Amino acid sequence: KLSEEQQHIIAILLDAHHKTYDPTYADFRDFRPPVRMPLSMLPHLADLVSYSIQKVIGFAKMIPGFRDLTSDDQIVLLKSSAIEVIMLRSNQSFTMDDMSWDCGSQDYKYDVTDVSKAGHTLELIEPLIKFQVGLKKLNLHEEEHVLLMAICIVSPDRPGVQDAKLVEAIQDRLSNTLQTYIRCRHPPPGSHQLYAKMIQKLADLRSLNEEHSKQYRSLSFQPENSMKLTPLVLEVFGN
């Protein structure tokens, strides 16, 4: 059932993730320092997000079929998916011991109060925590984790897509790979309705995307706040 091409796809996505995710979190020392005291966490979290957008781009470039698209379509897909892929990939450091993102040290252990000290409200933070918990409870294999990130990126219904037919064909190769992987390698009971549960998480991400863009647009409208963002964040999330 799991064809040789499908095993190839999984191998590439695993390697792409390993080359774009550093579980030592050593680069966090280059960010502007976190200040927990005003939006005191905006500079650190802006650098953290900007750093992760770069990692998301590096992963997306290695998705089988992604570079067959036009440059315009690659840009639309990454602009619309970046915040969602960051939410997905940040689950690797999320802990249910205390509902925090543990990135190796106390300075880099982030909770709900750090998100609020970047300007965001419970309208986003509450559904964000529920999403992180529900995704962690799925206990995805690393193979399913990287497949879900790739499917999120290559979605044909994103606004501004030109060749939606080509985007769908690429995602279909990935969706069938995931569906077959669950039916051959994920033992029950963990596999029960697992594909449908993962597709529900993509729907949850669309709603989280909308609320983040809403709060981002209000935060970035004040020039004092935009001044603390990075050039890449302004290009991807909006100016």
């Binding site: 781009i57 590096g58 440059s71 690659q74 840009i75 602009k79 050039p231 290009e235 991807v236």
Partner: peptide
């Protein structure tokens, strides 16, 4: 329009 995204996608 998106020169930094474009360059990282190169």
């Amino acid at each position: 329009n998106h020169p930094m995204l474009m360059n990282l996608l190169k």
